[PDB]
Swiss-Prot record:
It comes from Homo sapiens. GO terms for cellular component: ciliary basal body; cytoplasm; cytosol; glutamatergic synapse; midbody; nuclear speck; nucleoplasm; nucleus. Expressed in immune cells in the lung (at protein level). The phosphorylated form at Ser-53 is expressed in normal breast tissue cells but not in breast cancer cells. The WW domain is required for the interaction with STIL and KIF20B. SUPFAM superfamilies: FKBP-like, WW domain. Changing residue 28 to A: Loss of binding to phosphorylated target proteins, including to phosphorylated RBBP8/CtIP; decrease in DNA repair of double-strand breaks by homologous recombination less efficient than that observed with wild-type protein. One of its GO terms (biological process) is negative regulation of SMAD protein signal transduction. It catalyses: [protein]-peptidylproline (omega=180) = [protein]-peptidylproline (omega=0). Residues 1-32 form the WW domain. This is Peptidyl-prolyl cis-trans isomerase NIMA-interacting 1. The modification Phosphoserine is found at residues 53, 90. The lineage of its organism: Eukaryota, Metazoa, Chordata, Craniata, Vertebrata. Phosphorylation at Ser-53 by DAPK1 results in inhibition of its catalytic activity, nuclear localization, and its ability to induce centrosome amplification, chromosome instability and cell transformation. Ser-53 is dephosphorylated upon IL33-stimulation of dendritic cells.
Length: 145
């Protein structure tokens, strides 16, 4: 299994699935290092974020638990195809990168916060993370290159 992936059993259906503890990605299908990757992200901040403020809200008051529920709902809509990642990032990311549809550009190791970096480099091109936690808040990460 690729780096970070483990086999688990679904609690509701009993079907095997795969989980990546680095990216917090999960999927039914069996899954299958570059100097630099390019990623987009969608950040939801919460009251304990290092700077609890964004272009969306001067004072961010939602709890960390409420932020996770928002992230979970965005992931659901992205995976169902009801929304695409870029449209949600443009509307709802608590980050100036929302204006760039979440794009952060390319980066190598040693430049981003560690949980974000580790998840970014564990994704395959085109793959999306689950909720990734940093001092900024909770991220959904899309590796684009």
């Amino acid at each position: 299994l690729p780096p970070g992936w483990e086999k688990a059993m679904s609690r509701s259906s009993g079907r095997v699935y795969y989980f990546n503890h680095i990216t917090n990605a999960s999927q039914w299908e069996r899954p299958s290092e570059p100097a630099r990757v390019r990623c987009s992200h969608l950040l939801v901040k919460h009251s304990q974020s290092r700077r609890p403020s964004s272009w969306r809200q001067e004072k961010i008051t939602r709890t960390k638990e409420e932020a996770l529920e928002l992230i979970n709902g965005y992931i659901q809509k992205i995976k169902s195809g009801e929304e695409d990642f870029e449209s949600l990032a443009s509307q709802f990311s608590d980050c100036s990168s929302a204006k760039a549809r979440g794009d952060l550009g390319a980066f190598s190791r040693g430049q981003m916060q560690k949980p974000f970096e580790d998840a970014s480099f564990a994704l395959r091109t085109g793959e999306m993370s689950g909720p990734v936690f940093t001092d900024s808040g909770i991220h959904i990460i899309l590796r684009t290159e």
